[PDB]
Amino acid sequence: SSHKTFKIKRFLAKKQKQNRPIPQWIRMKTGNKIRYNSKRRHWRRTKLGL
Amino acid sequence: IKARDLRGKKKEELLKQLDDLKVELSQLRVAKVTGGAASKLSKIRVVRKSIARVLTVINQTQKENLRKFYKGKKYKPLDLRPKKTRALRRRLNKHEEGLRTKKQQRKDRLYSVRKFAVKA
Amino acid sequence: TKGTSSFGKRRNKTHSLCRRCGSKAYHLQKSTCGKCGYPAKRKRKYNWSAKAKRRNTTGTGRMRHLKVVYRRFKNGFREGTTPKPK
Amino acid sequence: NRQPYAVSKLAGHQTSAESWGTGRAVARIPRVRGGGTHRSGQGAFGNMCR
Amino acid sequence: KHQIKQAVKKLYDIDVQKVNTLIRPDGEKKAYVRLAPDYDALDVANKIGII
Amino acid sequence: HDFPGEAAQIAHQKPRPTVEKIILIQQPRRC
Amino acid sequence: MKFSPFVTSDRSKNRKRHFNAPSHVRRKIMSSPLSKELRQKYSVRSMPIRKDDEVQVVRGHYKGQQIGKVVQVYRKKYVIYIERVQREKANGTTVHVGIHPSKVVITRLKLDKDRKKILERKAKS
Amino acid sequence: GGRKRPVPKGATYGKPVNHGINQLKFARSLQSVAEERAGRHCGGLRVLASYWVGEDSTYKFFEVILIDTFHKAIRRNPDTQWITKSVHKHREMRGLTSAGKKSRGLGKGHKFHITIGGSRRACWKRRNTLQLHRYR
RNA sequence: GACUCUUAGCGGUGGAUCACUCGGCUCGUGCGUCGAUGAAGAACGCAGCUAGCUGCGAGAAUUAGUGUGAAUUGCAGGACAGAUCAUCGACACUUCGAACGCACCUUGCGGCCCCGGGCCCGGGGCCACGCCUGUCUGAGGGUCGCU
RNA sequence: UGGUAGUAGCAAAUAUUCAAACGAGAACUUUGAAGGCCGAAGUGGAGAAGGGUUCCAUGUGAACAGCAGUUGAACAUGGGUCAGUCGGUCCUAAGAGAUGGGCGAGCGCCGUUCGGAAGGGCGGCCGAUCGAAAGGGA
RNA sequence: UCUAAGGCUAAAUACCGGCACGAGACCGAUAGCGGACAAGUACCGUAAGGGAAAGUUGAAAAGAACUUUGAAGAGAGAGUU
RNA sequence: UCAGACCUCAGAUCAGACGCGGCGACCCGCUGAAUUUAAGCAUAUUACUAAGCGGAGGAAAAGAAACUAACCAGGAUUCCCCCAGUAACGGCGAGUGAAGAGGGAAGAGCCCAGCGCCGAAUCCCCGCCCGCGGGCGCGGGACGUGUGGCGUACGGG
Ligand SMILES: [Mg+2]
Ligand SMILES: [Mg+2]
Ligand SMILES: [Mg+2]
Ligand SMILES: [Mg+2]
Ligand SMILES: [Mg+2]
Ligand SMILES: [Mg+2]
Ligand SMILES: [Mg+2]
Ligand SMILES: [Mg+2]
Ligand SMILES: [Mg+2]
Ligand SMILES: [Mg+2]
Ligand SMILES: [Mg+2]
Ligand SMILES: [Mg+2]
Ligand SMILES: [Mg+2]
Ligand SMILES: [Mg+2]
Ligand SMILES: [Mg+2]
Ligand SMILES: [Mg+2]
Ligand SMILES: [Mg+2]
Ligand SMILES: [Mg+2]
Ligand SMILES: [Mg+2]
Ligand SMILES: [Mg+2]
Ligand SMILES: [Zn+2]
């Protein structure tokens, strides 16, 4: 909704910044095992609820 | 920039060097969003830790003078009192735990365990 | 009906975020969190759920201060002194 | 001179799995409670169950 | 708004007519600081490295 | 970035349970 | 045998303490033997590897008598790089081949104020 | 008075053994309850003792003696430093006072075989522990 | 000979088997330490390039001190000549939370003191409840005295 | 992992066609033209609850969008929400809930006036506080 | 035979939590803790709660330059070992 | 009482302290079931268990006899072995069930009130002054509605 509280909007800010893909220079490190960001969330498939 | 070279500096000279590092870090933050160069992006972490060094010497100097001012006083600020453990701070003092009643002081003086040996 | 048509009439959040446990179990009308028992002075924990206890017990989080007491205990909680300088 | 070895007491029992009963075309084994997890609907207590 | 207005008057020694503040979706607060008509926003932008 | 397929669908895949839990009178006369 | 109850002989504990050793500990682990001329001069058998040290590969494919100076000490990979121990990639560019410090012998030591202090302590005992 | 069973509508769902609601007696005495309420309201004090001062048809009056274990008149007297210890925190909640200790069944002799080994639950746990030796 | 059947080679699907193990389990030993000096937990933020993990608190991927003595490393850089790491007695440690001015589905609403700037703005320190001792201000023919 | 099986199916709400453009590639995109539908209790234009970046620009055509796709609510990179006078904030509505008091083994519960309850300028109030983005409200 | 209705008091004892260690006729990735991995994570439910899957290139990335077909995936040579 | 004292009871963002929550394996005080067994089931059993609530500590608790015993006597508590699946309990059905003694681990014993002697001989607080303790106050209190010393059943003065 347009009528947001500060805590909810701040909560949506953190979840929006975490939705980035993994930078490709991480995959070139020594003991790298991460192929891709497995915690990606889509707005239509997984709802936050909070 | 070293903390050992800041110990002799006055508090006015430390504050003058503090704002010089703050105006430098702000210009590096401007260069970060305006493209800039990698030579200035690597300086961001350097100036950030230089501000931390100057502020640490300032905080450590005033905290030392506060402990020297409240040295040997009955009531000290809570940040100057020792923080060991909430349970430890509520124990009896070294003098209190060593206090014995006058009746026990006589039983310890007269009937203390002697040093002895038995032949067989 | 009781099924699909009834699920379309769900647009009123019952629970919200809690200020104590940060979970979404704070009942709005009851003003009471069903997870940590907020705003009761004591946290809601029960022995009939061992899995729920080990999800929010000491050690499951960050321990900003208990990890320091564990380090200070190995030295006897020494304060007011400094290492010998060079 | 040998040391005692034993399996943990909570092994295979730290789960709330209830049998679906009969009539579901299943094998009457205690299955994990439902959810959005691949664990949901799997045997959890018997020795034959993974 | 009073803190943002007083900050830019000390960091840049300019004058501010009004301050419009919004909080971006990413969690950062963006401040629209309009300068006095006697100051030039283009002159201050080039003095601090914006343009 | 040479893993485009799986990195794009990782946010769209949803786990599912192994087994999905779903929800005549027959009495003739002349006894 | 090992009689101290403070030291462990467990394979998992010794392997975990090796691959997760701090940088200042990996320095001690990444030691190399001194040459015959150096082992007799300083009376020290082995020293921790150093950047400007010259070494000779004694085992592997790049072993020989060519004295090469170390160019990089990669403690995170438990391997060092030598000035001539290298190979050419597919695109023609050369890349250094990692050699374990226990596979090279130190023929020349980068002697500074700290290097001579360690040679004096190791030879004193 | 006694202790009425706090169950809804007096319905204890179970066997007729536990169908009692009215004629039930609390395990501790009314004097022990007085110290528990006097010590709970004053968390900064430790209950020392208590005595009976009055009765009625519905009220029993007691006076509980509490101590401020952080007062210098208590911490400097070696005869009273024992109560300033942290092991005596809320003795009335653990039945360590004179009135709360009576309801535990402690004592020497054949009358108190049930509390041999400290408390009753300590005795029951030892009496029901299967000691399995190595070379049994 | 299409199809079909069997067998074998090879190639697919699939992942068994074997080998591997910085993990688990069990046993034993020594310690056995939280919090109003703000705990556990939670929130949010912090890296040149950084999502998660991890580590930190606006001094934010760490400061100082000490030990160690040339690295860190995915890449860039010169910050860097006491690098790095470990240790940790100094300092610092945002918001919520027993959470404490009143409230909180609100970054809402106040009060007091002090300071700076132009009643307004900013900063700093304070204002939960219960209770112990003492102090101060009181209350009632409750018991006396003096009027 | 099979037979089933390249099978069931891709059939509710009248309907598309022509030319051109971009492009390796067009029944599906875009522009133009024609023919139609919604027909103002709309298939129109704006909100509330809810969603939370789905909004916008550019780019990709790999997975997804059950045909395709040069397209997208997909993916990738940047950008975007500016208030004294719009709402919150303020008021109490049904309510909820502290204090005194009472109860209760106890966490606590009951209770909303009921106790020396006026912290103001001679004082009456009688009940702290919370509770409306559709009520009141410059 | 003891002297109730007042109090204090170490050791031998307990320890599935925590901290730090040593060990194993134990388990060896459908096993052993749910968790050898960004695991109480992803994900589900309004909530209380439920709760996974997932270890292995090589000794060393030396991870296949370059040529060529295709719009591209995807191939053919070449090359590393 | 130079007219106020005392008693009782209030207020404060008074001076200085304390309490709150977490953990809860072990430990202390309460509360409290039913599956189950009895081939049913009701007492019984499960069980003075789980769950529920309170309170701690590195241990806790207990602990120096209103004991055991009936002896030629033992001598605080806790734990181990044994007593013993025994005495006893129980629709005397199912089932339940200790202790004295004896052998070991460890061992440590003590303090009040009351009673009557001692000029309250006792204590806290503030300030000052010395090296968290000490003196000093012709400082403020507490206390005779009882502080301190002696003294506690083994007797004591
Ligand atoms: Mg949806
Ligand atoms: Mg005496
Ligand atoms: Mg279970
Ligand atoms: Mg005791
Ligand atoms: Mg095959
Ligand atoms: Mg769009
Ligand atoms: Mg677009
Ligand atoms: Mg398609
Ligand atoms: Mg997207
Ligand atoms: Mg309101
Ligand atoms: Mg309105
Ligand atoms: Mg343990
Ligand atoms: Mg497993
Ligand atoms: Mg507690
Ligand atoms: Mg039966
Ligand atoms: Mg039966
Ligand atoms: Mg229980
Ligand atoms: Mg012990
Ligand atoms: Mg004890
Ligand atoms: Mg029984
Ligand atoms: Zn909560």
Query: What is the experimental resolution, given in Å to one decimal place?
Result: 2.4
The Cα of F27 is separated from the nearest Cα of chain D by a number of Å equal to: 21
Strand (E) or helix (H) holding G74: strand G68-74
Are chains C and A in contact at 3+ CB pairs closer than 8 Å? yes
**Are residues H35 and H92 in contact, defined by beta-carbon separation less than 8 angstroms?**
yes
Is the Cβ atom of G25 within 7 Å of strand I at any atom?
Answer: yes
Nearest CA in chain B to C85: B4
Distance CA H123, CA H103 (A): 16
| Integer CA distances (angstroms), A21 to A45, B103, E11, F7, F11, in order | 17, 78, 37, 8, 11
Residue in E with minimal Cα distance to A4? E25
Residue C6 assigned as binding residue: no
DSSP state of H46: E
Please check whether strand J approaches the CB of A5 to within 7 Å: yes
- The H-or-E segment that residue H94 falls in is none
Distance of CA H21 to the CA centre of its chain: 23
The size of chain C, in residues, is 86
Give buried/exposed letters for E10-47 (b at 16+ CB in 10 A, else e).
eeeebebeebeeeeeeeeeeeeebebeeeeeeeebeee
∠ CA(G25), CA(G30), CA(G33), 5° rounding? 130
From residue B70, give the alpha-carbon distance in Å to each of B79, B90, C9, G11. Answer: 11, 21, 67, 56
G52-57: list long-range contacts, CB under 8 Å, 24+ apart. G52/G110, G53/G106, G53/G108, G53/G109, G53/G110, G54/G106, G54/G107, G54/G108, G55/G80, G55/G82, G55/G104, G55/G105, G55/G106, G55/G107, G56/G104, G56/G105, G56/G107, G57/G82, G57/G85, G57/G99, G57/G103, G57/G104
Which positions ≥6 away from G97 have C-beta within 8 Å? G62, G81, G85, G86, G87
User: Is B85's CB within 8 Å of C79's CB?
Assistant: no
DSSP letter at G34 equals B
Q: Quick check: G106 and G118 in contact, CB under 8 A?
A: no
DSSP states of C19-85:
TTT--S-EETTTTEETTT-TTSSS----TT-HHHHTTSSTTSS--TTHHHHHHHHTTTS--S--PPP
Nearest 5°: CA angle at F13, between F12 and F17? Answer: 145
H or E, element range at G116: helix G113-124
Is C44 among the annotated ligand-binding positions?
Answer: no
Within an 8 Å CB–CB cutoff, is residue F6 touching chain A? yes
Contact G118, G49 (CB under 8 A): no
Q: Give the C-alpha separation, G98 to G85, whole Å.
A: 8
- Half-sphere exposure of residue H81, counting CA atoms within 13 Å on the CB side? 16
Q: How many CB atoms lie within 10 A of CB G99?
A: 24
Q: Could you give the 3-state DSSP secondary structure of residue G57? A: strand
* Distance (Å, whole) CA H15 – CA H31: 33
Cis amide linkage into residue C39, ω under 30° from 0:
yes
The rounded radius of gyration (Å) of the Cα atoms in chain B is 29
Sign, Cα dihedral of B99, B104, B105, B110: negative
